[PDB]
Structure formats: C-alpha cells, structure tokens
Amino acid sequence: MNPDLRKERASATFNPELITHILDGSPENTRRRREIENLILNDPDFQHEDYNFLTRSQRYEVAVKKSATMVKKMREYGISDPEEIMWFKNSVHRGHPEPLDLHLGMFLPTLLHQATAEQQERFFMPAWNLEITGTYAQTEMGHGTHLRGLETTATYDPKTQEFILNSPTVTSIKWWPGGLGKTSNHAIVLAQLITQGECYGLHAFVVPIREIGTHKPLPGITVGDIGPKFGYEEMDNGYLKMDNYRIPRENMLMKYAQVKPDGTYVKKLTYGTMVFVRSFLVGNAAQSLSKACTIAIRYSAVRRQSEIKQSEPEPQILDFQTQQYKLFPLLATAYAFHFVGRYMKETYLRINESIGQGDLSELPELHALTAGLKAFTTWTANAGIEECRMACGGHGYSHSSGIPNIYVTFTPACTFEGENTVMMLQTARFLMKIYDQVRSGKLVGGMVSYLNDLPSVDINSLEGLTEAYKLRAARLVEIAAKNLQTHVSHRKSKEVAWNLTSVDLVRASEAHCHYVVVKVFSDKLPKIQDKAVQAVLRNLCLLYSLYGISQKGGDFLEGSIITGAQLSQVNARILELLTLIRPNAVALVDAFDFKDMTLGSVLGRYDGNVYENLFEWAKKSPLNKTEVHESYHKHLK
Amino acid sequence: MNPDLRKERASATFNPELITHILDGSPENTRRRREIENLILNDPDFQHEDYNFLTRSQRYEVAVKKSATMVKKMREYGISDPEEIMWFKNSVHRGHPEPLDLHLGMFLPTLLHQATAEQQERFFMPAWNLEITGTYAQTEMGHGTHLRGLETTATYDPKTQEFILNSPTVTSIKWWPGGLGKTSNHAIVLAQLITQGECYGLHAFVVPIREIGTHKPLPGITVGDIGPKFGYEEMDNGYLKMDNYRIPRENMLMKYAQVKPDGTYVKMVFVRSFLVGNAAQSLSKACTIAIRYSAVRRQSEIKQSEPEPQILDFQTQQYKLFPLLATAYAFHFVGRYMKETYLRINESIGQGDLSELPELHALTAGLKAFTTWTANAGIEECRMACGGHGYSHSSGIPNIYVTFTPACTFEGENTVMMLQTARFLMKIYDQVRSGKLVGGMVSYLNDLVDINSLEGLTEAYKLRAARLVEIAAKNLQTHVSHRKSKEVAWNLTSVDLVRASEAHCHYVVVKVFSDKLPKIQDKAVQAVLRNLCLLYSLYGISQKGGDFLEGSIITGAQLSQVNARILELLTLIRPNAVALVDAFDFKDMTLGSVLGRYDGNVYENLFEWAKKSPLNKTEVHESYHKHLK
Ligand SMILES: Cc1cc2nc3c(=O)[nH]c(=O)nc-3n(C[C@H](O)[C@H](O)[C@H](O)COP(=O)(O)OP(=O)(O)OC[C@H]3O[C@@H](n4cnc5c(N)ncnc54)[C@H](O)[C@@H]3O)c2cc1C
Ligand SMILES: Cc1cc2nc3c(=O)[nH]c(=O)nc-3n(C[C@H](O)[C@H](O)[C@H](O)COP(=O)(O)OP(=O)(O)OC[C@H]3O[C@@H](n4cnc5c(N)ncnc54)[C@H](O)[C@@H]3O)c2cc1C
C-alpha cells in the first residue's frame, strides 16, 4: 500500500477491528456481515460497468437485473433475517437505490400484514419470482406532506361491486413512487374512499396497472417515469393517472375498515404496526457520513500539497489544522450518529416489551424523538457529506472521489418519512405538551425530564458537557413556550400563534435532539471494555460536544450556561483534540469496514494507490471511447 | 398567469424595473442586455432539447455546436465589448459551462497580451474562424494549489533549437483544463523551464496537441477527457501527457523572459471579482425559483378552517428564503463595489501608487471565498425549501448547484484564499502595533451598540471583525511564544485566522450594502432594499450570536431583540418577495425551471416535462424482457 497510508495505520493507538465489532453489535455480527458481503463480491452476476460510465437508461437496466438476481439469490441462500437482508442488499447495490425498494419494503410487507388469504394468493405469492412486481403509491403531484389533501378517489359501485379509482386532476396524479415508472405491474394506491355519498378518508387498494407478461399499461391506466433528478438515476420514480379505473371490491385492504357488498362502511397497537413505525434513516445518515469521511480522510492522508514550513517537503494535507477542523468534527459526528442509531434500535426493542406489558406511556416520546433525530441527523449528515467532498479539493468534484454519488443518493433522506421542518415541528408539539404538563404540576420523565428543572458548569468533563447541552435544550424549549404564550395571550388563534413561533419551535427540537446525541455518545463510553478504544472514542465524544458548543456559542452564552471565558477554553480544547485525533484518523475510518466496491471511490481506496488508478479510470470513461469526438467533424472541422 | 403569482405581484410596493436598472448599472444597460438575450431566444441555431434529456456525449456535442456558432454569430453581429460578450454567451448556453471557455478567456487573451508578431500570426490569427482551438493547461493531477510543485518540464535543446515538454510522472500529467479533453488542438502549457542544466521557474509555452484537419493526437501527445463529474457535463475537462514532446523554441512566450539559441535565460483580481458576481447570480436564480414556487405551492395548514395556504405563508419558509434573498442583493452590491475598487486602484498603480494593492489582493481573495461558500450552501437551501419536487431537474436548482459549486475550489481554494486574507490582516495588525495609521476598509483596526439602527448594526460588524482579528493575533503570538516557530504557529492559528478573515469580509458586505441605500433615487425601491439590508445584518448576528456576545459587543437581551426584529422583517418583506425575485429579470430559458416559471403555471407544464423524459420513449423498458421476465 501507499507508504503514506501505512504510516498512518502504524501510528494508530488502538486496534480498529475492536471498533468494527462495536459498530456491528458483536464480533459474530461482523463475521456474518462480511460473509454475506463476500457472497456478492465474488459473484460475477452482481458485477457490471461503473454506474457513472452509463446512461440513465442503462443505469436503470443494470439496477433492475441486479435486483431480479438479488431476489433469486436471497431465496436460494435462505436469507430471511431482516438485518442480513439489509447487508445483502447493501452489498449488491453498493448504497445505490434500486427499483424493487418499495416492492420489497412496502408492497409485500403491507400484503403480509393486512391482506386476506385470497388476496395474498393473488398478489403476494406470484411475486416470488417477480411475476408480479408492486409499489406503494401515496404521494401526488399536489400533495406530499398534507395527506388529507390527497385527491385520488375510490368510489364504490354497488351494482358491480367494484371500486372506481380516479385521478380527477393534474395534481391528483400519483407522483414519485419508486418502481411505479417502469418496473411494477401492480401498485397499492392510497385514495379517499367514497361510498353511499360519504367520504371515509384514506384507504389502500391493490390496483393492477400493467398487463402480465407483456407489461403493457392496462386500459384507463397512464404510467411513466417522472424524469431525471439530482440523483437516483437507477430508480424509476413514477407517475400514475387512473381514468375511473375499476377493480374488484376484494382488492381493498380491509383489515381495519371494510366495505360490505352493499356499500356499507364498517368501523390497536401491535408488534405488527410497530415494524412500520420503525426507521433506519438515522443509521443511513451515520453510514453516509462515514463513507464520506472515510474517503476524505484517507485522501487527505494521501494528498500532499503546499507547505507548512518552507524547509520541509509538501506535507500531507491532513497536517493542516484547517483540514483537520473540516474533517475530524464530522468523523466524530459520524460516530455519534452510529451510537444514536443503535440507541434507537435498542429503544424499539424496549418499547415492544413495554407494549407487551400494556404500557403505552413512552409511545408519544418515541414518535417525537424519531421525527426529531431523523431531521437532526439527516440535515447534519447532508451538509457534512459536501464538506468532505470540498475538502478533497478539485478531485472531490469528479465522480472518482465517489462523494457526489453518496451525497446525491443520501440527500432526499431530508424529505423521506416527513419533511425535516415538519418533523421538527412535530417534535416541538410534544415538547410544548410536556412543558404545559410540568407547568400544571406534573413531574415528567424520559429524555425530557430536564423540563422539571425549568424555569431557567464544568466545561472540562463529559458530565459537565452533557449537562451544558441539557441546560441549553431546556433554555430553548422555554424560549419557544414563552414566545408561544405571548401570541396566544394576545388573543391570536392557537394556529396563528404556532406559525409565528415556528422558527423558535424548530430550534427547540434541534437543541433537544443535539442533547440526546451527546448523552447517548457519553453513555456509550463507560461500556467500552478495551481501554485504547475507549480513549479514542472519548476524544471523539469530547470533540463532538465541544464543537457543538462552539458552533452555537450564542445559545450557551445567552442562557448564561457557559461564560465568555469558557467559550475561549472550548475553542482552544477543540484545536488540541484535533492533533490528539490526528494519529488515529485513518484507523478510525478503516474501522467502518467499507470495501472499496461499496465506497465506489478511487480517492478513498483502502491501499491509497490513488493516482495510477485515477488515470486508468479516466481513460476508460465514455468520452474517450474514440480519440476524436464526432462533434469535431460536424462543427469544428 | 397563475392567479397566485399575480396577487403576489399586485401587492408589491415598488417597481421591479427600477431595481433591474440598478442591477445592470443603468437603464441603457438593461435595454441593451435585453436586446442581446432576444437575438438568441428567437434564433433557431441555439435551440435544442433540454440538456437533462441528453447523454453526457450529446451534451458536450450541443455545447460545442453552440459555442462554434456563438463565435461566428458574435463576430457577425459586431459584439466585441467583453461585457456584451458575457451577456450573449450567457443567453446561448443557458447558464451552463461551455468548451470554448478557456479558448476565449485564457488562450486568446494570453496571446493577445504576450505573443510576438510571429506567434500572434500563427496562433492568435487562426483562432478567428476557430481555425485553431486552444486552452490553457496549468493544473496537474498532483498539483493545483501549490504551483511551484508542478512537474511538467520544458528542457531547452540547444542543438535542435527547441524546447522538450515532458510529463515524467503520473502526477505530472495535466488535469482539469477545460477544452483540453476533445476540443483544443493547441494548448499553452505551464512548465518548469530548464536550460543549460538550470531550472528557472514556471513559463508558458504554446504546444500543438492535435493534428489540424483530422484532430488526431500528435505523436508523443496523449490526450483525453478526465471522466464524469458532479456537474460540468458539457465541459470536456481533460488531461495531457507529453512524452519528450518537441516544439519550436519560438513557441515559448517570451514577453517577460527570453531564451536565445545559446540557451541563455534573460530578464486574478478580475477573475475573483467575476466569481463574486457569479455567486450573486447563482444565488439569485435559486432564490427566484424557490420563492416563485413557494408562492405557487399550497400545502398543509395554519388555521383549521382556511384552505391550504401558499407555503410562503409559513414563518419557517420565510426564514429559509428571505435571508438568502437579502444575501443575493448584498452580494450583487459588494460585487459592484469590487469593480469600482479595482478600477480605482488600477488608476493609482499607473501613477506609481501601489499603497492599496495589498488590500486589493486580500479583499478580492476574501470576498471570493466568503461569497462563494455562502451562496453555495444557500443554493441547496433553496432546493430543499421546494420539498421533494426540488430534487427533480424540473426545479432547475440541482443544475445551478452543480454548475456553481466548483467556484469554491477553483481560482484559489476558499480556505487558502481566506488564509491569504488573514496574512494581510495580520500585517495591518502589526502595522498598527508599530504605531502607524492604516487606511482603506481596514482602518477600523486603528481602534484596537444600538441594535435598532442601520449604523449601529454596521458598527456591530466592525467590532466583531476587530475582535476576531485580535483573537487570532493574540493566539498567534501565544503560539510563537510557546512553540517558538513561525510556520508551526501559523498553522496552529489557521482556523482562527480564517475566522478573522470571514468576519472582516462579512463586515465589508454589510458596510457596502448599507452605504448603497442613500444612493437610491426611488423611495419605494430604497425602502425595500433597506429591509433586505437590515435582514441581512440582523440575520448574520443571530447566526453567529456567540461572536458578538463573546466580545461584549451585544448583550443577551439585545440578541433577543435581534431575533424578534428578524421575524418582524420577514413579515414586512413577504408582500414584495415575488417582485424582488422578478427584479432579477431572469428569463425562463436561462432558468431552466418548471417550478420557477415566470407565469407560475407549474403542474400542467410539469407533467409535460416528465412525459417528454427519455425513459418514456416507450411504454415498456427493454430491461423488462431481458431481466424482469
Ligand atoms: C428521491 C425521492 C424519492 C421519493 N420516493 C417516494 C416513494 O417511493 N413513494 C412516495 O410515496 N413518495 C416518494 N417521494 C415523495 C415524498 O414522499 C415527498 O417529497 C414528501 O412527502 C414531501 O412532499 P412535497 O415534496 O410535496 O412537499 P411539500 O410539503 O409540498 O412542500 C415542502 C416545503 O413546504 C414546507 N412545509 C410543508 N408543510 C408545512 C407545514 N405544515 N409547516 C411548515 N412548513 C411546511 C416544507 O418544510 C418545505 O420547505 C420521493 C421524493 C424524492 C425527492
Ligand atoms: C469543475 C472544475 C473545473 C476546473 N477547471 C480548471 C481549468 O479550466 N484549468 C485549470 O488549470 N484547473 C482547473 N481546475 C482545477 C482547479 O484549479 C484546482 O482544483 C484548484 O486550483 C485547487 O487544486 P487542488 O484541487 O489540487 O487542491 P488541493 O489543495 O490539493 O486540495 C484542496 C484541500 O487542501 C487544503 N489545502 C491546500 N493547501 C493548503 C494550505 N496551504 N493551507 C491549508 N489548507 C490547504 C484545502 O483547504 C482543501 O481542503 C478545475 C476544477 C474543477 C473542480
């Protein structure tokens, strides 16, 4: 390997393999994930020309065959555990999105959970070999966040006992569903149920959209791809227009609501529904940030440029303080998000045990924390990925860095499972609700128990830093509450008040979530058995928290949480941590255990042999298919 | 038009035309710019299918076709004024980069300002009928920022009287030059001059790389495209490897240094100013789209009873877009300021007065980094403020983002630039330390409160700048003191130094924006810009409250009033949002945005766009039969 990377790995003060165990959950987990990864790696059926060297059409085509192959292979290998299916799918698509995401993630799961025996035989079973391919169509051109505003109608017809699915306007057309564009022949559509002159709200219906065998669109059906996007080249995000399309009455999912043959409309928290409330975007954020950091840091250890001292030769750019400042706080963030994502997993499991005991008390906080962490981590990871890219200089801009694809692939996560701003406002509804409760004399519990200490620190220890974040969260919640009451007590409608306090409310949710990450990171440390590993993660933990304090110094000063002098100490300690982390930077990134193939990066290769490979890469790219480009003869010659 | 956009326009308290006048510098500049943009809009030779519906190869091809026609068309129309050239070229490529960029910006300009009668005869003249297509090759795979690290050599050969251009290592291969991939048959190459066993530094040579008429790479010449990037699809950024490749000794640009047959060796600010304008323009486009779309898009609710409101009515939406709108105008003004400044200092240089040249270099480097980094993040905020729809190329913001973002790394990597600014700031600091009075925009360092006034806010930025410079200076001393080494000390203080330059530059933008108001003749226009200026200043104080609180420049109670004033200002700006974006005068064609269309008729046009998308050439995709069946 490149002498420069070898030098970095030799300076590491800890064994990176021990951290990999921690990330996967156990040594055993690491082995299994690697085993599954190697199944795809050495399988030529999963190999193909570099995504970036292919047109959009060819990219979608490649994704399709790999997904089709993926299904057959997972069936044959007997991979049923959801975690293992995740690892397997990750290795096959290398973080890239694929056309069977909704089919496997929402279509089959919804049928398995709510469909009747006859329905599953008609819609679930035929999918085993993809005879049937489905997707979930909810979003419309005119409504994404505001569901109640959806326009698709499903009117019951007593005479023929079938539903009439209709897209009355341009805005009503379904828009975005992955696989809806060209892959799926069936789609579970969400529509406003209409029967006996009454609208009963949103209900789901199984609707065939393409003829089996020929894949031609069925009469009354209009489907297609929505066009090119920032990223997602391999995903056929689509649109669906239904011209008073008829389907059997038995195609409605009736586990919760039913429609009798005469048109009469009739009418719990389970482990079943809980699987749907589950989210993996926090882990997704951690992972994407990690990939970017791995690339940027390795490259920064490989790239030599400029000079620190005129007498010495060009140093590694990772020797520059500004370089370390750009990347080490993000590396610490990457780790913080991994621990938070693991905490959430733990919580889901803790919550099921509570539900099984009849205790639904922590559900409100779960839903608020879930919406909050999702927005906090996705936004932070989003910006962090681009910093990593720009930290690589000009080469970061080339697809050979691998970062532009990571960013473009990850960024819509700020939209998935609820707009980030809307989600933060959801977290704020809960924070205000708990605040009002404490106001009326109730002692509250949970991560939000600090509210019991309203109304409104040793900056050197982890405990004092956690406390500082706790106090800052309390302070921002207090500011939002008071400001909210000022509008209300001004005779304004609770709603107008809400809007006029929304910026403040989002900030309260943000502060709350940041405090949660810090506490979770800090709580992790005492549980690390290996002292060397513990020491490094501690430095990363100190950097994450100190850096957050510097980033929003105003929050801590305004609340008199820290003094101006303490802010100076915080800033100084941050610079000191950068160098303490420096000798371990590479090994910390190696611990993420990404294979070159997943990274899709010349610059971030494990071996550090960037330059020779960067040249081969460019020479094999499409514009060099010929020495002279036809445009020459036609317009220049 | 969409009645939602017309009611937004009807509520405007000023005439947008007057702001366009201010943006173009004068009413006549507008009329003239709008003339050119029309020469092109109605010309079939510049029409083609949406770039986003084409492959990388087809994009490059369309760019090449348009640029070639561009040169012919300009010459024939009489467009030679380099300003009118920007407008024309901007309309033609609809804001996208083009393969003749270096040819017109570096090749010709360099020849025209350094070539001899013989050279300007066989090099400059041919680049008339594009007979010759050239580019400038500086950057190498191994070096971009630190030029004296370049490896390309030009070893003079006394016997045959010709320089030998060589790429000894993989890292020495030229990398990135636009037009170097498949467009140019000639390239001015920057290389280490070596003659008579001695290296004399970097010098520029003109080297033919492709055979005229066939475009075949010449013997010893290896050329090609460097591959696909985040953006720049229509640009053939390339690589050049020269294997002991010989060129007439007479091919060296000897305007400043010469090499006779004996082998005896003898004897940037405008571009950064351009990028600041490029930052303002890109930010403006994004804002125009995001704001127009926010007035068109209705969703969710405020009051239970009322119908879905335009998302522009949500405070959060206003908070995301109005501060950025104010930033776009702020950046346009500081850009104009930079222009006035370099023109003035240029005039001094000519009279032997170079007293303001160091500040000019420093300010120009700092503002470039400050505005490009700010606009960069702002373009993405505009995209995300559009919801999922923003992610689609139908929003046109992703292309804007991808096209503008490299501005943060080329022409001086932002952090390196800020570091240069900091070097100047420290010098000035040491100068006042010695007891000297300094002038210029930095005269506030000779001195080493009211949140409700324009003057007080400007004053607040001044002190914040002074405070950060002082913190950097103090930390720098503390390090030279403890570490006893200047280079090590500089490095351990570099984050503080960058922060001080950022603070200095922010102060400049505010001050410039503020000094611009009294010069506005129309009262209504002056009134709206004033709100944007207050928003800009107040927003920055909130964003980095700790800087002001730390320096006892503002109290906690004042920070609170700042935040309250920002919210109030969003409200006061709301009624003028669309008109303020309309003022930019961007045409639908150069915006390439369905969501930001001037008429506001989004949805109907959106479906048509998707319907026309490449993946819908057929109802069923080929991949179905061969894989999913
Ligand atoms: C890559 C990608 C893939 C997708 N895949 C799928 C898929 O497979 N299936 C599917 O069903 N959908 C999919 N979608 C659509 C996604 O579900 C929607 O984008 C999401 O629901 C938000 O809808 P919208 O974009 O119209 O947002 P809108 O809410 O209409 O607009 C967003 C803007 O309005 C603001 N806003 C909205 N309501 C409020 C409020 N009450 N208060 C304050 N601010 C508010 C937002 O914060 C934001 O600035 C995808 C989108 C993308 C980009
Ligand atoms: C779209 C695009 C188009 C381009 N077009 C052209 C073109 O037409 N012609 C051309 O010649 N070039 C072109 N380039 C190359 C561009 O000029 C270089 O990328 C730029 O000069 C920066 O060089 P670098 O990428 O090697 O940076 P590097 O410096 O190698 O790396 C950047 C990183 O190193 C850090 N760093 C470097 N030096 C220092 C220092 N002294 N102190 C502290 N930190 C430091 C930076 O802060 C940053 O994080 C283009 C690049 C792009 C992306």
C-alpha to C-alpha distances, A148 to A169, A190, A241, B307, B373, nearest whole angstrom: 16, 11, 19, 12, 40
| Ligand 2 atom, smallest distance to A323 CA | 49
Q: Does B478 touch chain A (CB under 8 A)?
A: no
C-alpha to C-alpha distances, A400 to A602, A604, A614, B245, B378, nearest whole angstrom: 5, 9, 7, 29, 26
Residue with tokens 């240069």: B420
Q: Measure the CA–CA gap between A630 and B424, rounded to whole angstroms.
A: 50
Asked if residues B545 and B559 have their Cβ atoms less than 8 Å apart, the reply is yes
Sign of CA dihedral B252, B258, B263, B266: negative
Superfamily of domain A278-442: Butyryl-CoA Dehydrogenase, subunit A, domain 3 (1.20.140.10)
Residue in B494, B381, B410 with CA at minimum distance from that of residue B138: B410
Number of residues in chain B: 629
Q: Coil, strand, or helix at residue A621? A: coil
Cβ separation A503–B567 shorter than 8 A: yes
- DSSP letters for A409-474: HHGGGGTTTS-HHHHHHHHHHHHHHHHHHHHTTPPP-SGGGGGGG-----TTSHHHHHHHHHHHHH
The amino acid present at B345, given as its one-letter code, is I
Residue in B446, B442, B425, B452 with CA at minimum distance from that of residue B554: B452
Superfamily of domain B270-436: Butyryl-CoA Dehydrogenase, subunit A, domain 3 (1.20.140.10)
For residue A372, what are the contacts with CB-CB under 8 A and spacing of at least 6?
Answer: A423, A424, A426, A427, A509, A512, A513, A516
Q: Measure the CA–CA gap between B397 and B391, rounded to whole angstroms.
A: 8
What 8-state DSSP symbol labels residue A105?
A: I
Rounded to 10 degrees, what is the CA torsion of B137, B142, B148, B154? -50
Ligand 1 centroid to Cα of residue B288, in Å, is: 20
Looking at the DSSP assignment, which residues form a beta bridge with residue A186?
A: A134, A208
Residue in A171, A191, A242, A218 with CA at minimum distance from that of residue B607: A171
Point out the residues of A that are catalytic. Answer: 417
C-alpha to C-alpha distances, B200 to B142, B192, B267, nearest whole angstrom: 20, 7, 11
- Segment 103-132 of chain B within 8 Å of chain A by CB: 130
Q: Measure the CA–CA gap between B246 and A489, rounded to whole angstroms.
A: 84
Residue of B411, B574, B607 to mutate, interface with A, max A Cβ within 10 Å: B607
CATH code reported for the domain at B15-133:
1.10.540.10
Spell out the alpha helix ranges (H) of A500-621: 502-524, 531-551, 553-558, 564-581, 585-590, 596-599, 610-619
Q: Measure the CA–CA gap between B493 and B417, rounded to whole angstroms.
A: 15
Q: Provide the CA B11 distance to its chain's centre, in angstroms.
A: 33
Orientation of helix A531-551 relative to helix A16-24, angle to 10°: 70
Cβ separation A502–B556 shorter than 8 A: no
Structure token digits, residue A193 = 């149920």
Looking at the DSSP assignment, which residues form a beta bridge with residue B252?
A: B205
Ligand 2 centroid to Cα of residue B145, in Å, is: 5
Q: Measure the CA–CA gap between A167 and A586, rounded to whole angstroms.
A: 54
CATH label, B454-585, candidates 1.20.140.10, 3.40.1710.10, 3.20.20.10, 3.60.15.10: 1.20.140.10
Q: Coil, strand, or helix at residue A177? A: strand
Q: Does B552 touch chain A (CB under 8 A)?
A: yes
Ligand 1, CB within 6 Å, residue ranges: A 102, 138-139, 144-145, 176-178, 232, 237, 412, 415, 419, 421-422, 425; B 297, 299-300, 311, 314, 316-317, 385, 387-389, 391
Residue with tokens 């003060």: A13
Cβ separation B315–A503 shorter than 8 A: yes
Count CB pairs under 8 A between chains A and B: 337
Residue in B588, B537, B603, B577 with CA at minimum distance from that of residue B287: B577
What 8-state DSSP symbol labels residue B193?
A: E
Q: Provide the CA A434 distance to its chain's centre, in angstroms.
A: 28
Q: Measure the CA–CA gap between A403 and A162, rounded to whole angstroms.
A: 50
> Across the interface, which of A61, A176, A305 has its CB nearest the CB of B146?
A305
Report whether CATH 1.20.140.10 matches the domain A462-593: yes
C-alpha to C-alpha distances, B459 to B425, B450, B453, B455, B466, nearest whole angstrom: 19, 9, 10, 6, 11
Q: Measure the CA–CA gap between A326 and A172, rounded to whole angstroms.
A: 45
Q: Measure the CA–CA gap between B421 and B361, rounded to whole angstroms.
A: 8
Find the ligand nearest to A149 CA.
1
Q: Measure the CA–CA gap between B386 and B395, rounded to whole angstroms.
A: 8
What distance in Å separates residue B322's CA from the closest CA in chain A? 13
Contacts of B410 in chain A (CB under 8 A): 394
Q: Provide the CA B41 distance to its chain's centre, in angstroms.
A: 24
* Half-sphere exposure (Cβ direction) of B219: Cα atoms closer than 13 Å: 2
Radius of gyration for chain B, computed over Cα atoms and rounded to the nearest angstrom: 27
Residue of B386, B594, B619 to mutate, interface with A, max A Cβ within 10 Å: B619
Sign of CA dihedral B268, B338, B450, A472: negative
Sign of CA dihedral B126, B128, B132, B135: positive
Structure token digits, residue B421 = 């600014």
Asked if residues A324 and A581 have their Cβ atoms less than 8 Å apart, the reply is yes
C-alpha to C-alpha distances, A500 to A506, A510, B8, B185, B431, nearest whole angstrom: 12, 18, 20, 61, 49
Q: Provide the CA A613 distance to its chain's centre, in angstroms.
A: 31
Asked if residues A567 and A555 have their Cβ atoms less than 8 Å apart, the reply is no
Q: Is the peptide bond before A455 cis (omega within 30 degrees of 0)?
A: yes
C-alpha to C-alpha distances, B47 to B94, B219, B395, nearest whole angstrom: 10, 38, 20
Q: Measure the CA–CA gap between B79 and B94, rounded to whole angstroms.
A: 18
The CATH architecture to which B134-266 belongs is: Beta Barrel (2.40)
What distance in Å separates residue A60's CA from the closest CA in chain B? 8
For residue B111, what are the contacts with CB-CB under 8 A and spacing of at least 6?
Answer: B119, B120, B123, B124, B127, B188, B206
Phi, psi of A442 (to 5 degrees): -100, 135
Structure token digits, residue B7 = 């009611």
Q: Provide the CA B598 distance to its chain's centre, in angstroms.
A: 25
Asked if residues B175 and B226 have their Cβ atoms less than 8 Å apart, the reply is yes
Binding site of B for FAD, by residue number, is 139, 178
The amino acid present at A5, given as its one-letter code, is L
C-alpha to C-alpha distances, B143 to A167, A303, A393, B494, nearest whole angstrom: 57, 9, 10, 21
Residues of chain B with CATH 1.20.140.10: 270-436, 454-585
Q: Does B626 touch chain A (CB under 8 A)?
A: yes
Q: Does B290 touch chain A (CB under 8 A)?
A: no
Q: Measure the CA–CA gap between B241 and B141, rounded to whole angstroms.
A: 11
Q: Measure the CA–CA gap between A18 and A22, rounded to whole angstroms.
A: 7
Q: Does A384 touch chain B (CB under 8 A)?
A: no
Residues of chain B with CATH 2.40.110.10: 134-266
Q: Measure the CA–CA gap between B500 and B617, rounded to whole angstroms.
A: 55
What distance in Å separates residue B531's CA from the closest CA in chain A? 19
The bridge status of strand A174-178 relative to strand A134-137 is unpaired
The amino acid present at A316, given as its one-letter code, is Q
Residue of B300, B539, B569 to mutate, interface with A, max A Cβ within 10 Å: B300
Q: Provide the CA A60 distance to its chain's centre, in angstroms.
A: 21
What 8-state DSSP symbol labels residue A173?
A: S
Q: Does B544 touch chain A (CB under 8 A)?
A: yes
Cβ separation B491–A575 shorter than 8 A: no
Ligand 1 centroid to Cα of residue B382, in Å, is: 14
Ramachandran area for residue B223 (φ above 0: left; ψ -120 to 50: alpha; else beta): beta
Orientation of helix A321-355 relative to helix A363-390, angle to 10°: 160
Structure token digits, residue A562 = 């820290």
Phi, psi of B301 (to 5 degrees): -165, 160
Phi, psi of B530 (to 5 degrees): -60, -45
Using CB atoms within 10 Å of the CB of residue B313, give its burial: 0 to 12 exposed, 13 to 18 middle, 19+ buried.
middle
Cβ separation B227–A52 shorter than 8 A: yes
Point out the residues of B that are catalytic. Answer: 411
Q: Measure the CA–CA gap between B174 and B137, rounded to whole angstroms.
A: 7
Number of residues in chain A: 637
Residue with tokens 């996208």: B96
H or E stretch covering B428 = helix B414-433
For ligand 2, say whether the CB of B139 is within 6 Å of any of its atoms: yes
What distance in Å separates residue A52's CA from the closest CA in chain B? 7
For ligand 2, say whether the CB of B279 is within 6 Å of any of its atoms: no
Using CB atoms within 10 Å of the CB of residue B554, give its burial: 0 to 12 exposed, 13 to 18 middle, 19+ buried.
buried
The amino acid present at B486, given as its one-letter code, is K
Rounded to 10 degrees, what is the CA torsion of A571, A572, A577, A582? 100
For residue B74, what are the contacts with CB-CB under 8 A and spacing of at least 6?
Answer: B80, B85, B88
Residues of chain A with CATH 1.20.140.10: 278-442, 462-593
Asked if residues A167 and A151 have their Cβ atoms less than 8 Å apart, the reply is yes
* Half-sphere exposure (Cβ direction) of B299: Cα atoms closer than 13 Å: 25
Asked if residues B429 and B469 have their Cβ atoms less than 8 Å apart, the reply is yes
Looking at the DSSP assignment, which residues form a beta bridge with residue A224?
A: A239
For residue B94, what are the contacts with CB-CB under 8 A and spacing of at least 6?
Answer: B51, B589, B590, B592
Residue in B130, B232, B129 with CA at minimum distance from that of residue B177: B232
What 8-state DSSP symbol labels residue A163?
A: E
Orientation of helix A281-302 relative to helix A403-410, angle to 10°: 160
Find the ligand nearest to A142 CA.
1
Q: What is the resolution of this structure in A?
A: 2.2
Orientation of helix A321-355 relative to helix B414-433, angle to 10°: 120
Residue in B386, B318, B385 with CA at minimum distance from that of residue B578: B318
What distance in Å separates residue A527's CA from the closest CA in chain B? 34
Phi, psi of B350 (to 5 degrees): -60, -30
Spell out the alpha helix ranges (H) of A249-362: 271-277, 281-302, 321-355
Q: Does B146 touch chain A (CB under 8 A)?
A: yes
Structure token digits, residue B543 = 């964003």
Structure token digits, residue A405 = 């694809």
H or E stretch covering B92 = helix B82-92
Radius of gyration for chain A, computed over Cα atoms and rounded to the nearest angstrom: 27
Q: With b meaning 16 or more CB within 10 Å and e meaning fewer, what string describes B192-214?
A: bbbbeeeebeebbbbbbbbeeee
* Half-sphere exposure (Cβ direction) of A432: Cα atoms closer than 13 Å: 22
Contacts of B545 in chain A (CB under 8 A): 552-555, 557-558
What 8-state DSSP symbol labels residue A399?
A: T
For ligand 2, say whether the CB of B237 is within 6 Å of any of its atoms: yes
Q: Coil, strand, or helix at residue A303? A: coil
Q: Does B45 touch chain A (CB under 8 A)?
A: no
Q: Measure the CA–CA gap between A371 and A482, rounded to whole angstroms.
A: 23
Residue of B nearest to A133 (CA): B628
C-alpha to C-alpha distances, A55 to A49, A120, A293, B235, B402, nearest whole angstrom: 11, 37, 28, 17, 18
- DSSP letters for A52-86: GGS-HHHHHHHHHHHHHHHHHHHHHHT--SHHHHH
Q: With b meaning 16 or more CB within 10 Å and e meaning fewer, what string describes A502-540?
A: bbbbbbbbbbbbbbbbbbbbbebbeebeeeebbebbbbb
For residue B42, what are the contacts with CB-CB under 8 A and spacing of at least 6?
Answer: none
Q: Measure the CA–CA gap between B404 and B371, rounded to whole angstroms.
A: 12
Looking at the DSSP assignment, which residues form a beta bridge with residue A163?
A: A156, A247
The amino acid present at B51, given as its one-letter code, is Y
Residue of A nearest to B486 (CA): A309
Ramachandran area for residue B435 (φ above 0: left; ψ -120 to 50: alpha; else beta): left
The amino acid present at A43, given as its one-letter code, is D
| Ligand 1 atom, smallest distance to B311 CA | 34
- DSSP letters for B261-308: TT--EE--HHHHHHHHHHHHHHHHHHHHHHHHHHHH-B-S-SSSSSPP
Structure token digits, residue B623 = 């991949």
Contacts of B419 in chain A (CB under 8 A): 322
Contacts of A149 in chain B (CB under 8 A): 299-300, 308
| Other beta carbons less than 10 A from residue A360's beta carbon | 12
For residue A368, what are the contacts with CB-CB under 8 A and spacing of at least 6?
Answer: A426, A427, A429, A430, A431
Structure token digits, residue B460 = 């607040």
Q: Measure the CA–CA gap between B517 and B539, rounded to whole angstroms.
A: 18
What 8-state DSSP symbol labels residue B213?
A: T
Find the ligand nearest to A150 CA.
1
* Half-sphere exposure (Cβ direction) of A463: Cα atoms closer than 13 Å: 2
Residue in B372, B408, B360 with CA at minimum distance from that of residue B282: B372
